[PDB]
């Protein structure tokens, strides 16, 4: 291939006529195409939040959780509020795992 | 959070450098190019009537 | 209505701005209706007067 031209033609195909609005059916359930891209947007955001949460899961959240627990942890450094306690709990949890 | 910067004068000088470069690039590289193609069209569209009357009067081929 | 009639009524301000307009839409629309009605009235009276003469 040419490193300027092949992926250019491939992206032209993917952008213009490799459309998954009809090649995956999808007219039979959605009304318009302005409703599909409005849902493809929120689907892209939900896929992004799930992929970036799952790619490094055993972590203590920086963001304020609502007092909930991910899975069977419930008292671990994943669910702690003060960060130094979760820091030393991770330091003891890491040598065993 | 990040409310005051570490140096206010550095950020104000970055604003001055960026806006002064945008002023220079406008005034030097873009506005001549804007005005050449705008004023060729503008001089033709304003001159057209008097130009064609002057050229009608100047050529003897009628 | 506003082409010439409002321009002939303004004497440093207006003589029409004394009137509180009580129409739905703007004063240009009420004058546009009012001069059509004035033309119809003038025309009806004109060709009654001319028929009597």
């Amino acid at each position: 291939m040419a490193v300027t031209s092949f992926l250019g033609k491939a992206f032209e195909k993917y952008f213009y006529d490799f459309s998954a609005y009809e090649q995956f059916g999808l007219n039979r359930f959605l009304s318009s195409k302005g409703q599909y891209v409005a849902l493809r947007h929120v689907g892209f955001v939900m896929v992004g939040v799930n992929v970036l949460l799952a790619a490094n899961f055993p972590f203590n959240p920086p963001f304020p959780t609502i007092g909930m627990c991910p899975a069977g942890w419930e008292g671990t450094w994943v669910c702690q509020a003060d960060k130094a306690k979760a820091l030393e709990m991770y330091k003891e949890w890491k040598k065993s795992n | 959070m990040k409310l005051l910067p570490e140096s206010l004068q550095q950020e104000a000088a970055t604003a001055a450098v960026v806006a002064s470069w945008v002023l220079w690039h406008l005034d030097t590289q873009l506005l001549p190019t804007i005005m050449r193609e705008h004023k060729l069209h503008a001089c033709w569209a304003a001159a057209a009537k008097r130009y064609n009357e002057k050229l009608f009067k100047l050529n003897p081929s009628y | 209505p506003d082409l010439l009639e409002k321009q002939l009524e303004d004497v440093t301000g207006n003589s029409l701005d004394a009137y509180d307009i009580e129409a739905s839409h703007e004063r240009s629309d009420v004058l546009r209706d009012l001069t059509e009605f004035h033309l119809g009235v003038t025309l009806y009276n004109a060709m009654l007067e001319n028929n009597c003469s």
Partner: protein, 88 residues
């Protein structure tokens, strides 16, 4: 007849040999022409505004580091630590 020396450097036809180079504006060649013909005679208000802002924010940075110096000095002349012991 009108013989192509009356059309010299006045009227030319579309080129057949090769497309020429674009004629530069006098501001695109030398910065001195721009700086002495438009930048100083027309934009010196903007340059004065930018210099006023840079000097004023230098004044405010001087006020802020003198306040930091005052707080640091009155923590050193009290036997107390002037910060949060780092953090780690």
């Amino acid at each position: 007849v009108l013989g192509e020396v009356y059309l010299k450097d006045i009227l030319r036809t579309p080129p057949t040999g090769a497309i020429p180079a674009n004629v530069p504006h006098p501001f695109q060649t030398s910065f001195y022409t721009y700086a002495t013909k438009k930048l100083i005679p027309r934009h010196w208000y903007l340059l004065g505004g930018f210099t006023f802002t840079i000097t004023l924010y230098g004044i405010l940075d001087g006020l802020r580091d003198s306040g930091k110096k005052k707080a640091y000095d009155e923590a050193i002349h009290a036997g107390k630590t002037p910060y949060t012991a780092g953090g780690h």
